[PDB]
């Protein structure tokens, strides 16, 4: 391949993903596409994290875990939790949850 | 090309024969609307009753077209082209 094309495609630059067991992707185009490819997906399955657009451009393992921790708490704080959040009355106006009811 | 853009006064802009009908902003022959006002400095002396566009002898009044009026391009300043 001519050297001008190697530099245009940025194959000179080398990018690492730890979710891929330190697999190096040459060029930005190859690296920005892998986050949807198989190797990254498999690495995210191993961590137990769904491979969403949230975790694109996230290469380190410790960051992907902490971001997944943040997201899971965010979505749980978004959603209606009728098992703990619904209010019931037993007798004489004592406020209780659905389990206690 | 560069328009004077100075605060326009009471003086009315003129067009020569060849530029008659043209909007001074967009160079359209279509739908004259608002009458053109020019600044005092573009009107004073030998520049009295000269064409807003080219600078030849004025014969008719300059107008902004309806499109320039809707866009409020008539509010931008003295539209005499000085270059």
């Amino acid at each position: 391949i001519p050297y001008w094309l190697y530099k245009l495609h940025g194959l000179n630059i080398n990018y690492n993903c730890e979710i891929c067991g330190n697999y190096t992707y040459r060029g930005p185009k190859a690296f920005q596409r892998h986050f949807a490819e198989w190797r990254h997906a498999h690495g995210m399955r191993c961590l137990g994290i769904p491979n969403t657009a949230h975790f694109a451009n996230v290469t380190q393992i410790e960051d992907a875990v902490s971001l997944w921790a943040k997201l899971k708490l965010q979505k749980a704080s978004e959603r209606w939790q009728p098992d703990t959040e619904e209010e019931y009355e037993d007798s004489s106006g004592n406020v209780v949850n659905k389990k206690t009811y | 090309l560069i328009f004077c853009r100075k605060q326009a006064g009471v003086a009315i802009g003129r067009l020569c024969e060849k530029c008659d009908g043209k909007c001074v902003i967009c160079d359209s022959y279509v739908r004259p609307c608002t009458l053109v006002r020019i600044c005092d400095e573009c009107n004073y002396g030998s520049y009295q009753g000269r064409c807003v566009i080219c600078g030849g002898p004025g014969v008719s009044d300059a107008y902004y077209c309806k499109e320039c009026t809707i866009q409020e391009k008539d509010r931008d300043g003295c539209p005499k082209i000085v270059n």
């Binding site: 949230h54 979505k75 704080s77 978004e78 009355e89 106006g93 | 006002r37 509010r75």
Partner: protein, 878 residues
């Protein structure tokens, strides 16, 4: 859908009022700007009744108004500063009864812009020049003269721009026949924008600056500038040229100061404060408006404070200079937008809100305070407010400004509905009942204690339940406690005891003297049950200090049966700016004794202001901040049964139809929510594609919502067909991670089908028939006291005719203050599907030759055009 807008009752609020001989005769008239309407008033000097001679819609925002008379002139002209980037001079033609536009000079773009002039307008006292200014940077001076035909002429504008400079106020200075001068209160912001310590901002001084217009050299020079000790809020032109000393008074917080260019020392007098005032001790005082009365012999100014007290201000001059400023308390009237002294001995007070008053000046004006009297640090002048003495009330012009809430209903059993109108403001608030009829609408007013926010009609008794709330206000219990401690501090600091006992017995009515301003974040609120027939209070609940009621609903709960409950949503310790709140409460009352008495049940705490409460399916929806909760009744509390947490900002209103809930956001407009009964879920299924600052909403049909916004617009949003509202939440909660929706909101979008800018803020919208056997209209009421309708065309033929009439009138009869009509109606969004019948009815007011020209274009005759215009008016609303 195509609507036609008509005004039923024009805005009654007054923004500006000027005085002069507009007819040319010795009779004095008053030109008043309601915001979008210019109106000529003539008080009869014999009767003391104000007659409206002319009202015109100017389809713009009037931002300033001044009267000028050329030297040796006999007729006053009107100069208008507006939101069109044009200065307009008008002359009233008494024979034709119309305002003729004499001159219209264009200088900039339209809108209420920061740097394009229009906000401030000043005229040289001898009529030789007018200055129009922006809040920032730009000032233009137009030379005014007359030609050989004695017709007014206007020059090209001379500019007087300075970068980075804010203008607080401008007046012409009465210099006699010397070169015209304009005094400005200015502040340079340049050093503030460049200092990250914030120290320059704190050390920035307001300056008084005098721009002189050299008539010889044809340029404006900034001749003198001087910093001020404290920031002035406005200037008063002082009489000059041998009818006074010239110079200006600067009104600032706590002080009135006289300054003149030259060797005049500055003279400063403290503003006198009410003795034993219950207002928060920290607050100072500003004059809100001034009037000058120049008799040939003498001059005085009347200036009103923000508590409504008018002071007569006289300048004592010795050989063309001033030595002292003297202040005498004159009378207390409601806080005025404008006060105007008519030479016939009458004073017209255009209230800031509510009814306007014409008083007769019985006596021309107790201790006389003065700038020459010594005063120590902390010490001030003290006067005692007392009932009217120098003024006699002769006429009272009714105004609905501000309309805060409205219900159109037949509560009186008249078959024709009445309009129940919650009018502001403060202790001058009222519930007004409006009937179509002659005594266009006749009113009856019932007083209220605080600004009414909302009311609801109890279905079984037709009693109103009104919540009234004011910020900066004491409850009755707090005001009593404050009065007892002030009487105790009076004695502590035998004669004092007699003064304390007098003070506790002195009860100055709040409707007249104003309510005591408590501080920031202090609220007073009441829940009032009122009979709408004669407006007697059946029940009044005073809430605790610093609880502010913002929402109210009357409803039955399914679990409890037939009993009616009232729910009031209250905020606890709300600070408006910066916004913070200490939670809130929903109070629940049972409404008993045939809807007369409120019996307290319980108070349920909530985390945010419960700003909207809507009965829903035998339970209630409550919007608590940005959370939409379903609540059921319970025994000790309302019980939370369902929640949606996906609403963007803050819930300003909720409307329910079937299982759809339309939620108003404060800024992100309309969100459609489906309630699933079986799943017990609230799911957002659709939203809008524009920010709207929603004030009010009305459902027109099952898919269509009409909304109004803070900015004066009305919109109608509709769900497109095959909008599916049956969408469910993922039980696992995995789809929430994948689905991102559309444009960072709901996957389905509503379509805006109508946009129109009314020009005034609309706080109520209701779909109703106004006249029996008539057709349904969307009625709206504005905060300027204006009532309008939007009515649908039924025919293409009729829509096409009025569209053509509007097209011709937009060109043939363009708005008086130089604005483009289509631009003004498209102020925030492009107008869409509304014809303005306020413009189309100006056809009747046109000159007959212009009526003939337009009608020929329409291929009709002027009587036939007028008939069509009347036919649509009468179908929907008289």
């Amino acid at each position: 859908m195509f609507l036609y807008n008509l005004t039923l009752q024009r805005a009654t609020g007054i923004s500006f009022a000027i005085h002069g001989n507009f007819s040319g005769t010795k009779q004095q008239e008053i030109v008043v700007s309601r915001g979008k309407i210019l109106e000529l008033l003539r008080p009869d000097p014999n009767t003391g009744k104000v007659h409206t001679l002319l009202t015109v819609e100017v389809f713009g925002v009037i931002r300033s108004l001044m009267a000028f008379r050329l030297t040796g002139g006999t007729k006053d002209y009107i100069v208008v500063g507006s939101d069109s980037g044009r200065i307009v001079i008008l002359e009233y033609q008494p024979s034709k009864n119309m305002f003729e536009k004499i001159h219209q000079e264009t200088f900039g773009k339209s809108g209420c812009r920061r740097i394009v002039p229009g906000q401030f307008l000043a005229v040289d006292p001898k009529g030789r020049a007018v200055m129009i200014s922006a809040i920032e940077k730009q000032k233009l001076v137009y030379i005014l003269n007359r030609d050989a035909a004695a017709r007014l002429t206007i020059s090209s504008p001379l500019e007087a721009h300075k970068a980075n400079t804010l203008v607080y106020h401008v007046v012409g200075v009465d210099v006699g026949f010397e070169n015209p001068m304009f005094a400005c209160l200015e502040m340079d912001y340049e050093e503030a924008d460049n200092d990250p310590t914030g120290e320059a901002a704190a050390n920035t001084q307001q300056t008084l600056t005098f721009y002189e217009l050299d008539l010889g050299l044809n340029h404006v020079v900034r001749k003198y500038s001087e910093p001020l000790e404290e920031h002035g809020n406005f200037l008063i032109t002082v009489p000059g040229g041998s009818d006074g000393p010239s110079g200006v008074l600067i009104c600032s917080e706590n002080y009135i100061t006289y300054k003149n260019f030259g060797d005049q020392p500055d003279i400063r007098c403290p503003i006198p404060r009410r003795r034993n005032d219950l207002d928060d001790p920290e607050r100072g005082m500003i004059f809100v408006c001034s009037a000058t009365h120049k008799t040939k012999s003498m001059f005085f100014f009347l200036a009103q404070t923000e508590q409504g007290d008018i002071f007569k201000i006289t300048l004592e001059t010795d050989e063309d200079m001033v030595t002292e400023i003297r202040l005498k308390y004159f009378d207390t009237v409601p806080v005025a937008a404008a006060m105007c002294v008519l030479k016939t001995g009458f004073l017209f007070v255009a209230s800031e809100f509510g009814n306007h008053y014409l008083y007769q000046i019985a006596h021309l004006g107790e201790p006389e305070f003065s700038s020459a009297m010594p005063l120590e640090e902390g010490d001030t002048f003290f006067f005692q407010p007392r009932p009217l003495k120098n003024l006699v009330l002769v006429d009272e012009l009714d105004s609905l400004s501000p309309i805060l809430f409205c219900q159109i209903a037949d509560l009186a059993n008249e078959d024709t509905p009445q309009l129940y109108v919650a009018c502001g403001r403060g202790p001058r608030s009222s519930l007004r009942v409006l009937r179509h009829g002659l005594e266009v609408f006749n009113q009856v007013a019932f007083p209220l204690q605080y600004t009414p926010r909302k009311f609801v009609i109890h279905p079984e008794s037709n009693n109103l339940i009104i919540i009234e709330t004011d910020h900066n206000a004491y409850t009755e219990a707090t005001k009593a406690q404050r009065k007892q401690q002030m009487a105790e501090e009076m004695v502590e600091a035998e004669l004092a005891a007699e003064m304390a006992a007098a003070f506790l017995n002195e009860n100055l009515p709040e409707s007249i003297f104003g309510a005591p301003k408590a501080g920031n974040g202090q609220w007073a609120s009441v829940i009032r049950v009122m009979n709408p027939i004669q407006g007697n209070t059946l029940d009044l609940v005073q809430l605790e200090q610093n609880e502010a009621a913002f929402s109210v609903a009357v409803c039955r709960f399914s679990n409890t049966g037939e009993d009616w409950y009232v729910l009031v949503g209250v905020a606890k310790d709300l600070i408006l700016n910066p916004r913070s709140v200490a939670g809130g409460f929903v109070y629940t009352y049972k409404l008993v004794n045939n809807g007369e008495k409120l019996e307290f049940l319980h108070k349920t705490p909530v985390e945010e202001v419960p700003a909207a409460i809507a009965p829903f399916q035998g339970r209630v929806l409550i919007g608590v901040g940005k959370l939409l909760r379903v609540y059921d009744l319970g025994k000790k509390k309302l019980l939370r049964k369902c929640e949606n947490k996906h609403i963007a900002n803050y819930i300003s209103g909720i409307q329910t139809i079937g299982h759809r809930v339309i939620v108003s956001d404060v800024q992100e407009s309309f969100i459609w929510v489906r309630y699933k009964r079986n799943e017990n879920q609230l799911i957002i299924f659709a939203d809008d594609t524009y920010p709207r600052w929603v004030t009010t909403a009305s459902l027109l049909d099952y898919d269509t919502v009409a909304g109004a916004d803070k900015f004066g617009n009305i919109c109608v949003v509709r769900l497109p067909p095959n909008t599916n509202d049956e969408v469910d939440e993922d039980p696992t909660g995995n789809k929430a991670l994948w689905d991102r929706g559309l444009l960072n909101g709901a996957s389905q979008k509503a379509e805006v089908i109508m946009n129109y800018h009314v020009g005034e803020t609309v706080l109520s919208l209701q779909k109703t028939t106004l006249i029996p056997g008539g057709s349904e209209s969307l009625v709206y009421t504005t905060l300027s006291g204006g009532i309008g309708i939007l009515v649908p065309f039924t025919s293409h033929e009729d829509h096409d005719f009025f569209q053509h009439v509007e097209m011709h009138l937009r060109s043939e009869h363009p708005p008086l203050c130089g604005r483009d009509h289509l631009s003004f109606r498209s102020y925030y969004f492009p107008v869409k599907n509304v014809i303005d019948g306020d413009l189309c009815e100006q056809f009747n007011s046109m000159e007959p030759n212009k009526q003939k020209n337009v009608s020929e274009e329409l291929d009709r005759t002027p009587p036939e055009v007028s008939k069509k215009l009347e036919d649509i008016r009468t179908r929907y609303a008289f």
